[model samples]
Target: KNEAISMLTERLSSIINAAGGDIGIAVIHVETGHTTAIQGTTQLPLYSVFKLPLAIAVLKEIEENRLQLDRKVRVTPADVAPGWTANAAMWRRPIDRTVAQLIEVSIIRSDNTSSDKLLQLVGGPAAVTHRMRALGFPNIEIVSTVREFSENRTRPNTGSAEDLARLLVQLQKGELLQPQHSALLLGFMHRATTGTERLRGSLPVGTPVADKTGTGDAGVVTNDVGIITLPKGQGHLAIAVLISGSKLSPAAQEKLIAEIARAAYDAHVS
Candidate 1:
């Protein structure tokens, strides 16, 4: 029943407006594959988190034999982006790195240069979009690659909370990546250091959630999506939470997310 979700919607909306930006969130019911929404279906900005799909695309390319995991490539000064992470170095002296390493750091560490580099190596942004579309995500697009931001005049990236949550579930179900790959990716998400942005904000530490988070635009925008499985299979949930504006501090935003996670848990448990 929606009874449980009612307070969640009201609080989330209040948090978003008070926090100061537009937000989009969707909770995917892992069992029935159904979804609940606060502002569920809207499109929002995606930053470093794009690395997740980019990483997956690279994996698929390797699977196709079009790309090699162990293939070595050089880093150059031109490959760097201004704000993403320090780990990305593009050829000050030229360091040799592999495709697998790039993907790992790109997703796990949210490395900007590594992401853009993979975007190019995977045959550019269109390739990532093409593969995503072929896999049935029509609304997905990575408008700006890593290089674009350095050049300024930011291109736009858009994704619906529903779509993102679905992507997480597909990955969870091993619908695309191999079982090992899915587990690896999930582990990486769990390891992502949002500090207190999402999972830490939304649920207890012991909660089993492996997720990817997006951050950019002045601490104003945040997006998180992933799989949450409870102990004893008490409740298995898939959720997305997007927040913007002054209404939700990263702490407040996470508190909102946690509240919903609890609701989802209670719903499933009963």
Candidate 2:
């Protein structure tokens, strides 16, 4: 354990030196739970990454039959977000969509409108955090809708790197979700459309990773939480990398996270 910690510390310092930012990181082997944390407990804005828990809340409802994947939900003007960049398909268009479609677009497309709409479907922002707590994730917090976060920017939703890493571990271990539900969540995540520079960075091309990416426009934060399937089917690595309070460019922050991912991948899969 100490060996891992030392190596991680060295790698992180180098990455931050190159990228010029502070970071919060937590990595755990899904089996042994041997871990390393770097400022992991710091509460950082979840940005779009909160979508992971929102998806979980929605999936929990689906598991309990409280919600249907195909159930159509109406999109209201209030549900649409003018500040979101990833909602071109539903831009200025009123339409009804199924739950599954919303999850797909919200994750893979990082669509702000779709994410907020899904949050509404499950009840609201509080509902997501409440479900997370009830589902055994006590540290994760969801405070506002994506649109509201964009508007006020004062009280955005927040989560720790450690909390999110644990969330991924629980999902993988079938703790908070049933086997089928777990599979469903992973299936959605394995197709993430953002953060190519975060988790997927520096690893072999097409290396399978189930992950979620989050970014802030002001460059305050750039994060990725996911399970990386190691080479030769060795085992799984559950990792969360969050960079916050950074004056670095988005590209620089992303490169920092990517470098960390590559280091972790090399350490584990070797």
Across 1-270, the per-residue lDDT of candidate 1 in tens digits comes to: 456544555545554455556767777766577666765667776776677778888888977889887999888775665554566443356687898777777777677777777888888888888888987877678777766754663575767777777888788777878887777778777777763556555565577677777766556666667778866755467777766554555556666666656666655553
For candidate 2, report its TM-score. Answer: 0.91
Weakest lDDT window of 10 consecutive positions for candidate 1: 83-92
lDDT of each: 0.70, 0.82
> How many pairs of residues in model 2 come into backbone collision?
0
- Report how far residue 46 has shifted in candidate 1, in Å: 0.6
Q: What digit string (tens of lDDT, one per residue) describes model 2 on residues 1-270?
A: 346545876776677774546678988878778677788898788888899999899988888789998999877666666665556657566788899888888888788878877887789988888898887777788989887787798997888888899888888877878887788779989988787788887788868899999887778888899998877766788999888778788887888777888877776665
lDDT of 1 at 156: 53
